[PDB]
Amino acid sequence: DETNL
Amino acid sequence: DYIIKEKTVLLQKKDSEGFGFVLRGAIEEFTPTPAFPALQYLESVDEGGVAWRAGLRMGDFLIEVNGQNVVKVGHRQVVNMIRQGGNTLMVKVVMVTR
């Protein structure tokens, strides 16, 4: 998965 | 040989912004390896952002978030620890070379 933080 | 560049850094940010990085990562069959030492890693870092100025770069593996080992932890839980921290995040990462 990927997440912009 | 595996050249390791480990850093432990503190990010501090306003609310109108993110830390400036994309986190990617995965089962249960992961065994940590010098070539691949952790589950979560930095897919990219906004060069104009907060995580860049603190030394974080594409390809850093995430070892510890806010003081806790996240080598074997899953994406949703690591993202959660990071989100709990609010506007500050202490993270330990390693860069692997050769």
Side-chain angles (χ1 to χ4, degrees), chain A, chain B residues 1-27 29-98:
Chain A
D1 189 12
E2 306 172 81
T3 310
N4 177 220
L5 297 157
Chain B
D1 288 5
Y2 293 89
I3 283 73
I4 303 313
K5 214 264 170 163
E6 171 185 313
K7 46 201 309 157
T8 316
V9 297
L10 208 143
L11 283 68
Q12 228 307 142
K13 80 169 184 65
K14 308 157 179 162
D15 292 87
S16 66
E17 61 185 352
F19 295 121
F21 67 90
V22 177
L23 182 68
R24 189 200 286 235
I27 90 118
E29 63 195 358
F30 183 69
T31 289
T33 259
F36 323 105
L39 220 35
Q40 318 306 135
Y41 61 92
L42 305 188
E43 173 181 359
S44 60
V45 308
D46 299 328
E47 300 157 10
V50 173
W52 202 92
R53 306 193 314 264
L56 305 183
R57 303 276 189 274
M58 264 187 293
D60 273 344
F61 290 96
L62 253 70
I63 308 311
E64 301 188 351
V65 164
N66 298 143
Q68 196 166 5
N69 197 297
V70 292
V71 176
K72 270 226 78 178
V73 181
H75 188 89
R76 176 200 67 94
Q77 187 169 326
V78 175
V79 156
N80 268 250
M81 298 163 54
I82 289 171
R83 294 207 155 128
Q84 277 181 185
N87 297 348
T88 38
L89 163 73
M90 186 216 84
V91 79
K92 137 109 99 313
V93 305
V94 307
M95 190 65 264
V96 178
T97 291
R98 151 135 103 247

